[PDB]
Design a protein around this ligand. Structure first.
Ligand SMILES: CC(=O)[C@@]1(O)CC[C@H]2[C@@H]3CCC4=CC(=O)CC[C@]4(C)[C@H]3CC[C@@]21C
Ligand code: NA
Length: 134
């Protein structure tokens, strides 16, 4: 048996690697809060996270859809709750014509009783990102 948290996190990645916008959003609760990273950033403007399914849809359009985002799991850290889990992820992206970005950080997931994602939080900053010219 896979826990609702692990199923959710892995499903989110598969939908990302296939640019399935609708399937991606269906894995989330209507009150989902995405904080990638935690704190103020271009991917987290006010530093309190992207709140709501509409705003995460916009986030997908702005930062994932045409940016070739792919997430790779390096190590999984289960908790003693089936609804919360942590991963060491490596996120890669391609933008502005072919410029690349890559960062490795801790990502925590949380689902509600129905198993829908309510929280996704990333522990990383700019100094951890690496950029490319090909
Ligand atoms: C462009 C960037 O700054 C990043 O590549 C660096 C951090 C990346 C997160 C990592 C976590 C992840 C998990 C998923 O399964 C869905 C997609 C996201 C949210 C993914 C979006 C692109 C981000 C924001
Ligand atoms: Na994943």
């Amino acid at each position: 048996t896979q826990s609702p948290a692990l199923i959710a996190s892995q499903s989110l990645g598969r939908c990302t690697q296939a640019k399935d916008r609708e399937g991606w959003l269906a894995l989330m609760a209507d009150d989902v809060v995405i904080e990638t990273p935690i704190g103020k950033s271009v991917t987290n403007p006010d530093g309190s996270g992207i709140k709501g399914k509409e705003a995460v849809g916009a986030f997908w359009d702005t930062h994932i859809a045409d940016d070739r985002v792919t997430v790779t799991c390096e190590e999984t850290f289960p908790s003693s709750s089936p609804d919360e889990i942590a991963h060491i992820l490596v996120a890669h992206a391609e933008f502005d014509g072919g410029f690349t970005s890559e960062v490795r950080g801790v990502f925590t997931y949380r689902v509600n009783k129905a198993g829908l994602i309510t929280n996704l939080r990333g522990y990383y900053n700019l100094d951890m990102m690496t950029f490319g010219n090909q």
